[PDB]
Structures are given as structure tokens and as C-alpha cells.
């Protein structure tokens, strides 16, 4: 299933976006990509972020990292980018997204946002 998904990912205009869960953190045969969006990566693995950045290069391309303010993710992202800045890369900070309210997005109202709390607290892995 993974092989066929990755095989049809590149030569298909209908579908051009996939989600990976820590599987692409090694040397695979992933096809050429221009946009990478990482969310909730590992703690402070500079190796993981460097590998993920390596999956894009082959402004031809650009990759984004999404973090949550006032959380440990801020410190994690700060401490895991020190390798790439030594490599010479600079991380521009984006605080506003143009046309955020231009179109409709998920979680537009507070009802589903507060409904998400029950399902995100439903883990209770004890």
C-alpha cells in the first residue's frame, strides 16, 4: 500500500499531497516535492529536521514548520533549527497568513472547536 501510494503520488495531477508519520525520516525513494509542512515532530532531533529538509531539495522549493506559541514546541523548534542555521539556512518567522478569512476553512466556529476537546481528551491512556 505504501509503495503504490508513493508511486501514484508523483505521476497524478488529481492527487499531489500525502501525509507521513515518521516513516520518511530515513533515506527512501520519495519523489521530488516542492512544499514540506511538518507538524508536531520529535522533541529536539536536529537529525530528523535535517533529513526532512533533505527530502525537498534535489526559490524552486520551500518548506514550512508549524508550531504552537506559548508551548514546548517553541523551544523545541528553536533548539532543533540550530543545525540548519549553521548550514546557512535562515528561518523567516510568519505571524499572519494572507487571506486567512478569504475562504472557508475547518474549525470556523467555536462549536466544533470545543467539540474537539472531548475527542482530544478521550485518549485517557491509563
Amino acid at each position: 500500500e505504501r509503495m503504490q501510494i508513493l508511486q501514484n503520488f508523483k505521476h497524478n495531477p488529481k492527487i499531489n499531497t500525502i501525509f507521513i508519520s515518521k516513516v520518511g525520516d530515513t533515506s527512501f525513494d520519495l519523489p521530488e516535492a516542492n512544499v514540506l509542512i511538518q507538524i508536531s515532530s520529535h522533541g529536539g532531533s536536529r537529525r530528523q529536521e535535517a533529513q526532512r529538509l533533505g527530502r525537498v531539495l534535489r526559490y524552486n522549493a520551500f518548506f514550512y514548520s508549524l508550531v504552537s506559541q506559548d508551548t514546548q514546541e517553541m523551544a523545541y523548534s528553536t533548539k532543533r533549527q540550530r543545525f540548519l542555521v549553521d548550514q546557512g539556512y535562515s528561518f523567516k518567522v510568519i505571524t499572519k497568513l494572507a487571506g486567512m478569512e478569504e475562504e472557508d476553512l475547518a474549525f470556523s466556529t467555536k462549536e466544533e472547536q470545543q467539540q474537539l476537546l472531548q475527542k482530544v481528551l478521550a485518549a485517557t491512556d491509563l
Binding site: 506559541q69 506559548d70 508551548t71 514546548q72 514546541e73 517553541m74 523551544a75 523545541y76 528553536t78 533548539k79 540550530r82
Partner: protein, 66 residues
Amino acid sequence: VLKGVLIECDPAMKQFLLYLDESNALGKKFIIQDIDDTHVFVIAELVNVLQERVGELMDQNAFSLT
């Protein structure tokens, strides 16, 4: 009537102060009146401990490069 200090900030810090009120992290319930989703009304005699707590929260998740 109530006398004190109005504090205006983002809702995140407002709810952080609300949590500090119920958690008794400062020793009492000095967060008396909540007026707006982004504004609070706190007694002024212990603004310094609130500032210290806010600074600790801010620089905790900062990873200072020094």
C-alpha cells in the same frame, strides 16, 4: 466598588492567569473580577509576583542560546 489594576493581554495569558487563580499558585484568589475575554481586574498589591510568573512562563519555552 472595586479598586485595583486592569490588565489587558491576549486570551492565552488571560486564561493562564485564570488557571493561576484556581491553582492557587500565588497563595490566594487575588484574581477577583474577570470583565472581558481579553481583560482582567487584579488587585495591585502583588503585581510583581504575577510579572515574575509571566516571565518564567515566557522564558521557560524559549531555549536561550546563551
